[PDB]
Amino acid sequence: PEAPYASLTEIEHLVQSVSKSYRETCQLRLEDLLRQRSNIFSREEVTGYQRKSMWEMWERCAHHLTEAIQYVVEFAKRLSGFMELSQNDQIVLLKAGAMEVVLVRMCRAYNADNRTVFFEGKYGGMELFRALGCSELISSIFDFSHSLSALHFSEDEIALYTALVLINAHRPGLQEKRKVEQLQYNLELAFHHHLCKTHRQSILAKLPPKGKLRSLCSQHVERLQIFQHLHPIVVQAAFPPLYKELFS
Ligand SMILES: Cc1c(CN2CCN(C(=O)C3CCCC3)[C@@H](C)C2)cc(F)cc1NC(=O)c1cccc(C#N)c1
Ligand SMILES: O=C(O)c1ccc(-c2nn(C(=O)c3c(Cl)cccc3C(F)(F)F)c3cccc(F)c23)c(F)c1
């Protein structure tokens, strides 16, 4: 809801609702990603990935990213007020924000102890993705996940943070900007309430600087678009109007 004078009841139900939506749209539970940290690709398995073609690695990565986006879109549609927005406004928020949320969620699958990430059943370093020839971009994604891992987000914290990545009234092309401002205001009030209540306000000053996530997402999506133009993946679109905006 967008209503003014959001009560303590509304705010705490917004926290619970967003956290449930987050937990139920994760590909794997946090406890399963943590329990798989000891399951690491052997040097033989890493060499097998490195000897794959650029196009086979592109297909594997693109497949995972398509699924990650689709989960974020499920998450967005569960956020209160989102499905009451116009289709234009839903697509404006997702086109910018969906990959930004995917990039934030990646930190759950990042192990800062040995700089590995979960990929197709085991953990491996960035040398696993050598065949793609995107060493600088993948290095920036690892760095960003490392910076987010240092915050030690609770499930509530990462849920509210990613809800605010999506429900942002400053995306160009919104026709109901005032309505999204009111939704965002209430999410910010919930986020700040929750952080104050749990004595975790110290994380606010440590969140990624204004524009860093947007910039990383821009570099990432630019690269994905170039790969798609040169070797298009065939996606069965779960959300055809959104798909048309990104793949046309
Ligand atoms: C794989 C992974 C990377 C590295 N990876 C390199 C290739 N990529 C590109 O975009 C390439 C660069 C442009 C062309 C393709 C991304 C997929 C990122 C970093 C990271 F921080 C976390 C992850 N893993 C997950 O997040 C994950 C995987 C499976 C299940 C779950 C869950 N639940 C999470
Ligand atoms: O209807 C669907 O099921 C659907 C699934 C994924 C997206 C999607 N893709 N995407 C890519 O960057 C991407 C991916 Cl994940 C893989 C290969 C090629 C691409 C390309 F770069 F071409 F868009 C996005 C970026 C931002 C916001 C998005 F919503 C997407 C989409 F728009 C719709």
Stated resolution in angstroms = 1.9
Tell how far the Cα of 100 is from the centroid of ligand 2, in angstroms. Answer: 12
Read off the tokens for 210: 């204004």
Structure letter (DSSP) for residue 82: G
Rounded CA separation 122/49 (Å) = 12
Query: What is the residue with the minimal CA distance to atom 22 of ligand 2?
Result: 225
Specify the number of domains making up the chain. 1
Nearest by Cα to 164 from 74, 97, 213: 97
Rg (CA), the chain: 19
Q: How far, in Å, is the centroid of ligand 1 from the Cα of 124?
A: 11
For the sheet with 110-111, list strands across it: 110-111, 116-119, 122-124
Instruction: Tell me how far apart the alpha carbons of residues 128 and 115 are, in angstroms, rounded to a whole number.
Output: 12
Please state, in angstroms and rounded to a whole number, the distance separating the CA atoms of residues 238 and 44.
36
Q: Which domain holds residue 102?
A: 1-248
| Experimental approach | X-ray
Distance 90 CA to ligand 2 centre (A): 15
Closest atom, ligand 1, to C-alpha of 145: 21
Decide: 68 and 102 in contact? Cβ < 8 Å.
yes
Rounded CA gap, 205 and 210, in Å?
11
**Distance from the alpha carbon of residue 84 to the mean position of ligand 1, in angstroms:** 32
Query: Which ligand gives the minimal distance to the CA of 235?
Result: 2
Q: Which residues contact 8 (CB under 8 A, 6 or more apart)?
A: 193
117 lines ligand 1 (CB under 6 A): yes
